[PDB]
């Protein structure tokens, strides 16, 4: 079926204006609201290929996680995709230290929420959804020029009582 989104299960006329995500959100009222959200910092054309963010994760630099309830260096790592032995080196740790639930550690890359995380559209043209926002086909820019691309918006789009929620 869907993904983690399924809002093209309840949330119909699923239409984006180029990247900001439109639709009617069916909420639990048995009724449909117009629900809009900006894919733009969501979707990413990789290569003439839509992809969310980076596809996984990825990273580059220098940034400081907050580390949760019964978390330790190498879930860190696994969760921001980073060497649970660097975040130790940074913060002057070991990995198999194990640290401590609200605490700061540097990480190469942050999680995010939605600024500046996928861009399709600046070198994505005549963008529009198919299949009822289960789908999003666009031309995406890429080293061989312009290719049609498409990605799943259902798969992490989803409507939670007529509101367009990322999962």
Known sequence: GNYAGNFS??????????????AECRRGDGGYSTSV???NRYLSNDNGHFRWV????????????TVQQGDTLRDIGRRFDCDFHEIARRNNIQNEDL???????QVPTKGGSGGGAGNF???????RLVDGGKVLEAELR???GWNRSRIYLDEHIGNRNGELIHC
């Open 54 to 65: 980076s596809g996984g994760g990825g990273g580059g630099g220098t940034a400081t996680v």
């Open 99 to 105: 640290i401590y639930p609200g605490q700061v550690l």
């Open 37 to 39: 959200i900006d894919l």
């Open 9 to 22: 299960g309840s949330s119909r006329d699923i239409c984006l204006d180029g990247a900001r995500l439109r």
């Open 142 to 144: 890429y080293s061989g």
């Open 121 to 127: 559209w600046d070198s994505a043209r005549d963008v």
